Scaffold this motif. Structure first.
Motif, PDB file in Angstrom:
ATOM      1  N   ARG A 212       0.839  -1.187   0.000  1.00  0.00           N
ATOM      2  CA  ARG A 212       0.000   0.000   0.000  1.00  0.00           C
ATOM      3  C   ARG A 212       0.876   1.238   0.000  1.00  0.00           C
ATOM      4  NH1 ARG A 212      -4.243   0.382   4.737  1.00  0.00           N
ATOM      5  NH2 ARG A 212      -2.731   1.677   5.894  1.00  0.00           N
ATOM      6  N   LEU A 213       0.456   2.249  -0.750  1.00  0.00           N
ATOM      7  CA  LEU A 213       1.194   3.499  -0.790  1.00  0.00           C
ATOM      8  C   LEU A 213       1.140   4.181   0.572  1.00  0.00           C
ATOM      9  CD1 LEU A 213      -0.018   4.927  -4.300  1.00  0.00           C
ATOM     10  CD2 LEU A 213       2.162   3.793  -3.733  1.00  0.00           C
ATOM     11  N   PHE A 215       2.467   7.988   2.322  1.00  0.00           N
ATOM     12  CA  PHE A 215       3.043   9.306   2.064  1.00  0.00           C
ATOM     13  C   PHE A 215       3.299  10.063   3.367  1.00  0.00           C
ATOM     14  CE2 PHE A 215       0.722   8.048  -1.757  1.00  0.00           C
ATOM     15  CZ  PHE A 215       1.652   8.302  -2.767  1.00  0.00           C
ATOM     16  N   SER A 216       3.622   9.336   4.449  1.00  0.00           N
ATOM     17  CA  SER A 216       3.758   9.992   5.748  1.00  0.00           C
ATOM     18  C   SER A 216       4.849  11.061   5.734  1.00  0.00           C
ATOM     19  CB  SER A 216       4.031   8.951   6.834  1.00  0.00           C
ATOM     20  OG  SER A 216       5.300   8.365   6.644  1.00  0.00           O
ATOM     21  N   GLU A 219       3.010  14.221   4.305  1.00  0.00           N
ATOM     22  CA  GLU A 219       2.198  14.756   5.385  1.00  0.00           C
ATOM     23  C   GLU A 219       3.058  15.522   6.391  1.00  0.00           C
ATOM     24  OE1 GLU A 219       0.885  12.671   9.545  1.00  0.00           O
ATOM     25  OE2 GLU A 219       0.721  11.564   7.671  1.00  0.00           O
ATOM     26  N   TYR A 272      -5.630   8.411  10.436  1.00  0.00           N
ATOM     27  CA  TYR A 272      -5.763   8.654   8.999  1.00  0.00           C
ATOM     28  C   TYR A 272      -7.007   9.476   8.709  1.00  0.00           C
ATOM     29  CZ  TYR A 272      -2.106   5.753   6.821  1.00  0.00           C
ATOM     30  OH  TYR A 272      -0.904   5.241   6.380  1.00  0.00           O
ATOM     31  N   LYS A 275      -6.722  13.157  10.032  1.00  0.00           N
ATOM     32  CA  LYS A 275      -5.728  13.871   9.231  1.00  0.00           C
ATOM     33  C   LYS A 275      -6.242  14.138   7.827  1.00  0.00           C
ATOM     34  CE  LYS A 275      -1.772  11.629  11.566  1.00  0.00           C
ATOM     35  NZ  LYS A 275      -0.360  11.163  11.367  1.00  0.00           N
ATOM     36  N   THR A 276      -6.893  13.146   7.214  1.00  0.00           N
ATOM     37  CA  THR A 276      -7.412  13.343   5.861  1.00  0.00           C
ATOM     38  C   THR A 276      -8.459  14.448   5.839  1.00  0.00           C
ATOM     39  OG1 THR A 276      -6.980  11.036   5.229  1.00  0.00           O
ATOM     40  CG2 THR A 276      -8.606  12.271   3.944  1.00  0.00           C
ATOM     41  N   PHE A 279      -6.865  17.909   6.196  1.00  0.00           N
ATOM     42  CA  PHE A 279      -6.216  18.444   5.005  1.00  0.00           C
ATOM     43  C   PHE A 279      -7.244  18.844   3.972  1.00  0.00           C
ATOM     44  CE2 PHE A 279      -2.325  15.891   6.245  1.00  0.00           C
ATOM     45  CZ  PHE A 279      -1.582  17.003   6.573  1.00  0.00           C
ATOM     46  N   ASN A 318      -9.298   9.710   0.250  1.00  0.00           N
ATOM     47  CA  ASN A 318      -7.896   9.822   0.587  1.00  0.00           C
ATOM     48  C   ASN A 318      -7.318  11.082  -0.043  1.00  0.00           C
ATOM     49  OD1 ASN A 318      -4.874   9.184  -0.259  1.00  0.00           O
ATOM     50  ND2 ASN A 318      -5.354   8.010   1.592  1.00  0.00           N
ATOM     51  N   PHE A 324      -9.934   6.750  -3.685  1.00  0.00           N
ATOM     52  CA  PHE A 324     -10.046   5.831  -2.558  1.00  0.00           C
ATOM     53  C   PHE A 324     -10.923   6.477  -1.485  1.00  0.00           C
ATOM     54  CE2 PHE A 324      -8.616   1.869  -0.744  1.00  0.00           C
ATOM     55  CZ  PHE A 324      -8.962   2.038   0.589  1.00  0.00           C
TER      56      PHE A 324
HETATM   57  O1  LIG Z   1       0.885   9.045   4.905  1.00  0.00           O
HETATM   58  C1  LIG Z   1      -0.215   9.383   4.558  1.00  0.00           C
HETATM   59  C2  LIG Z   1      -0.984  10.441   5.144  1.00  0.00           C
HETATM   60  C3  LIG Z   1      -2.220  10.717   4.752  1.00  0.00           C
HETATM   61  C4  LIG Z   1      -3.003  11.808   5.455  1.00  0.00           C
HETATM   62  F1  LIG Z   1      -2.221  12.429   6.379  1.00  0.00           F
HETATM   63  F2  LIG Z   1      -3.463  12.728   4.605  1.00  0.00           F
HETATM   64  F3  LIG Z   1      -4.085  11.331   6.109  1.00  0.00           F
HETATM   65  N1  LIG Z   1      -2.909  10.053   3.757  1.00  0.00           N
HETATM   66  C5  LIG Z   1      -2.224   9.013   3.147  1.00  0.00           C
HETATM   67  N2  LIG Z   1      -2.650   8.152   2.199  1.00  0.00           N
HETATM   68  C6  LIG Z   1      -1.502   7.299   2.040  1.00  0.00           C
HETATM   69  N3  LIG Z   1      -1.487   6.223   1.175  1.00  0.00           N
HETATM   70  C7  LIG Z   1      -2.682   5.838   0.418  1.00  0.00           C
HETATM   71  C8  LIG Z   1      -3.614   5.110   1.418  1.00  0.00           C
HETATM   72  C9  LIG Z   1      -3.291   5.003   2.780  1.00  0.00           C
HETATM   73  C10 LIG Z   1      -4.144   4.380   3.695  1.00  0.00           C
HETATM   74  C11 LIG Z   1      -5.333   3.765   3.290  1.00  0.00           C
HETATM   75  C12 LIG Z   1      -6.229   3.116   4.286  1.00  0.00           C
HETATM   76  C13 LIG Z   1      -7.378   2.403   3.919  1.00  0.00           C
HETATM   77  C14 LIG Z   1      -8.207   1.821   4.887  1.00  0.00           C
HETATM   78  C15 LIG Z   1      -7.946   1.980   6.238  1.00  0.00           C
HETATM   79  C16 LIG Z   1      -6.833   2.718   6.632  1.00  0.00           C
HETATM   80  C17 LIG Z   1      -5.989   3.282   5.666  1.00  0.00           C
HETATM   81  C18 LIG Z   1      -5.663   3.864   1.923  1.00  0.00           C
HETATM   82  C19 LIG Z   1      -4.817   4.522   1.002  1.00  0.00           C
HETATM   83  N4  LIG Z   1      -0.441   7.637   2.830  1.00  0.00           N
HETATM   84  N5  LIG Z   1      -0.914   8.709   3.537  1.00  0.00           N
END
Ligand SMILES: O=c1cc(C(F)(F)F)[nH]c2nc(NCc3ccc(-c4ccccc4)cc3)nn12
Ligand SMILES: [Zn+2]
Length: 356
Positions: A212-213, A215-216, A219, A272, A275-276, A279, A318, A324
């Protein structure tokens, strides 16, 4: 009632800044682990995602819980998107020198996570075994990420997540994400997207060797250079409440999860989601004057209000991958989001009893 919020922020600030040997104990352990992993063929280039900052905290209210990322650079990888999930990927290689150091974790074309983790977890197990001085234990629990949780002494917990690092362009699923253009500028967006991206082992549902991607690092860079004005929060005439509002949103959720940890309905919500939503409100309100220090109460309320709107509509894209939906009913079901809606509205209507 912004006076109560300031006091909440003051306690949180004091707790975090209070002198603590925690970070120094976890540094010792992390440094032993890195050296021992660097001695192994598959992990020769493993290193810390944040160097000098061993103290990244997921739970803004739990000072003894630490979260560290071990990154490992993989050149020339091919990502195949898994099942149109937009965020989950098979990791293949262009493998122009077929003897890539991770070749030992291959299943045909596809990099195996459970194999990499079981070796990662085994090297880690072999060093927490050889621990001198203080006592540390490995609590190996389900989920690919974090890979392991270390418990130091009676109170300290360290989550260690393994992460592949790619210095190539971000996957197409991100092309319309990170919509900071009217806030942090289009030129900053381009700068950020030239930075690497990370991949952590993870499954979409609760079978396959997907990544999974993550991007911490982006952030973090946004939060530390967060204003439309380049001087935001440097002076006192342009001091803003963006970071305060995030901390309040995080602390609200953490307090409600703790308040209801026996009922389970809130177990899928995490940092998550707050934070999402935060933003997203930063894009909606790009001007530093919309985040005036003096408007902490109104600014917090816009954040709570937007978060409640996401819950009821079951939509929370996301921030990096707009397609997503974090609040889809396959990830969190209606009754769970409706439960959270009710609790937050009870907090807002009684001047946040969790902040007492
Ligand atoms: O590091 C950060 C920081 C933020 C922010 F600070 F903005 F919140 N968003 C962010 N999205 C990603 N990757 C894509 C991604 C990550 C997690 C999930 C996921 C799904 C289901 C449950 C839990 C998580 C789905 C896609 N990295 N990432
Ligand atoms: Zn600011």
């Amino acid at each position: 009632g912004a006076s109560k919020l300031r006091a909440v922020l003051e306690k949180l600030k004091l707790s975090r800044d209070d002198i603590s040997t925690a970070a120094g104990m976890v540094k010792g352990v992390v440094d032993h682990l890195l050296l021992r992993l660097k001695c192994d063929s598959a992990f020769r280039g493993v290193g810390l995602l944040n160097t000098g900052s061993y103290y990244e905290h997921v739970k803004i209210s739990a000072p003894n819980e630490f979260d560290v990322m071990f990154k490992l650079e993989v050149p020339r990888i091919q990502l195949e998107e898994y099942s149109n999930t937009r965020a989950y990927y098979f990791v293949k290689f262009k493998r122009n020198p077929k003897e890539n150091p991770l070749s030992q974790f291959l299943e045909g074309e596809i990099l195996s996570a459970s194999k990499m983790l079981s070796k990662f977890r085994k090297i880690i197990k072999e060093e927490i075994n050889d621990i001198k001085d203080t006592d540390v234990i490995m609590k190996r629990k389900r989920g690919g990420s974090p890979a392991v949780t270390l418990l130091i002494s009676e109170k300290i917990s360290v989550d260690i997540t393994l992460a592949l690092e790619s210095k190539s362009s971000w996957p197409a699923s991100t092309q319309e994400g990170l919509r900071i253009q009217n806030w942090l500028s289009a030129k900053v967006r381009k700068q950020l997207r030239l930075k690497p991206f990370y991949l952590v082992p993870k499954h979409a549902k609760e079978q396959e060797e997907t990544w999974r991607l993550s991007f911490s690092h982006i952030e973090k860079e946004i939060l530390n250079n967060h204003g439309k004005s380049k001087t935001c929060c440097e002076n006192k005439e342009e001091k803003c409440c963006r970071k305060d509002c995030l901390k309040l949103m995080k602390y609200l959720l953490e307090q409600l999860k703790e308040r209801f940890k026996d009922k389970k309905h809130l177990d899928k919500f995490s940092s998550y989601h707050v934070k999402t939503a935060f933003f997203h409100v930063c894009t909606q309100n790009p001007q530093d004057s919309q985040w005036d220090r003096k408007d902490l109460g109104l600014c917090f309320d816009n954040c709570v209000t937007y978060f409640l709107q996401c819950l009821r509509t079951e939509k929370l894209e996301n921030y990096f991958i707009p397609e997503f939906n974090l609040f889809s009913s396959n990830l969190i079901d209606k009754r769970s989001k409706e439960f959270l809606t009710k609790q937050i509205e009870y907090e807002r209507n009684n001047e946040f009893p969790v902040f007492d």
